[PDB]
């Protein structure tokens, strides 16, 4: 099941009964650039993994999911301090939506002029929202110094975020903020921690499996 807004700039795609991928198009130099996160439909509200490029898109994403699922967005996990992830932080804060992050992500957000998420996540943090279990894991530096992954142990779904490249990505993209001698080790740390993975959601591009991790390793050669 895929559901879209009018222009198609926001889309939600169902992985299972309570887990959807959200995808938004940002516009840069005339080019549409998609970005993915997660929508978790829990008994106590909606939880997102990541916001979107800006506040306009974040507001519309929130409004779409609250209407559809008939409950409020209560929490967002921000997986690094780039605009695709954190661009909607003003909206989250003013609506009273909790914005979780590592301390480092919050430190980088502040340095770069964004409002700050909570800085509450550790190297491993286990959260529960209603019956939905969520683990966050900092595997080390890669796409950025601060990138984290999110694991849903009830589904063995990994949100790789922008640490993990989709099959369609043929290069590493912008590496200004990346750690290209460490990114492989960080990917290996993910593979070590999660030895049995169903889906892997990359930050940009199509959902895949463990193969996306191996693809990212190959791109780093
Ligand atoms: C703006 C995002 C932040 S993760 C980005 O760097 N992307 C998005 C797609 C690839 C890569 C790039 O521009 O090189
Ligand atoms: Zn990024
Ligand atoms: Zn990204």
From Swiss-Prot:
CDD domains the record matches: BcII-like_MBL-B1
Top EC class for this record: hydrolase
Principal place of residence: periplasm
GO biological process, alphabetically ordered: antibiotic catabolic process; response to antibiotic
Short name of any one Pfam family annotated for the protein: Lactamase_B
Positions that bind Zn(2+) 2: 84, 162, 204
The enzyme's E.C. designation: 3.5.2.6
PROSITE patterns the record matches: BETA_LACTAMASE_B_1 (PS00743), BETA_LACTAMASE_B_2 (PS00744)
Alphabetized UniProt keyword annotations: Antibiotic resistance, Hydrolase, Metal-binding, Periplasm, Signal, Zinc
Any one Gene Ontology molecular-function term assigned to this protein's record: zinc ion binding
Binding site residues for Zn(2+) 1: 80, 82, 143
Superkingdom classification of source: Bacteria
Regulation of its function: Inhibited by captopril stereoisomers and iodoacetate. Also inhibited by chelating agents such as EDTA.
Subcellular location: Periplasm
Coiled coil regions, renumbered to chain: none
Cofactor note: Binds 2 Zn(2+) ions per subunit. The enzyme can also function with only 1 Zn(2+) ion.
Residues the record lists as binding substrate: 165, 174
Cofactor section: Zn(2+)
Catalytic activity: a beta-lactam + H2O = a substituted beta-amino acid
SUBUNIT field: Monomer.
UniProt record similarity statement: Belongs to the metallo-beta-lactamase superfamily. Class-B beta-lactamase family.
Function: Confers resistance to the different beta-lactams antibiotics (penicillin, cephalosporin and carbapenem) via the hydrolysis of the beta-lactam ring. Active on cephalosporin and penicillin.
Protein name (Swiss-Prot/TrEMBL): Metallo-beta-lactamase type 2
């Amino acid at each position: 099941t895929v559901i879209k807004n009018e222009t198609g700039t926001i889309s939600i795609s169902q992985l299972n009964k309570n887990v959807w991928v959200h995808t938004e198009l940002g516009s840069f130099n005339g080019e549409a650039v998609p970005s993915n996160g997660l929508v978790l439909n829990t008994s106590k509200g909606l939880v997102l993994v990541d916001s979107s490029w800006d506040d306009k898109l974040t507001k519309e994403l929130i409004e779409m999911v609250e209407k559809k699922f008939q409950k409020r967005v209560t929490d967002v996990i921000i997986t690094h301090a780039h605009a695709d992830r954190i661009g909607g932080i003003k909206t989250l804060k003013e609506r009273g939506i909790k914005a979780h992050s590592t301390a480092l992500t919050a430190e980088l957000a502040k340095k770069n002029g964004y409002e700050e998420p909570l800085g509450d996540l550790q190297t491993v943090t286990n959260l529960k929202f209603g019956n939905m279990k969520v683990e966050t894991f900092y595997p080390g530096k890669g796409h950025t110094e601060d990138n984290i992954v999110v694991w849903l142990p009830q589904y063995n779904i990994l949100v790789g975020g922008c640490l993990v490249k989709s099959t369609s990505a043929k290069d590493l993209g912008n590496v200004a903020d990346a750690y290209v001698n460490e990114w492989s080790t960080s990917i290996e740390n993910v593979l070590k921690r999660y030895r049995n993975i169903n889906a892997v959601v990359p930050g940009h591009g199509e959902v895949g499996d463990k193969g996306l991790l191996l693809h990212t390793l190959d791109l780093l050669k």
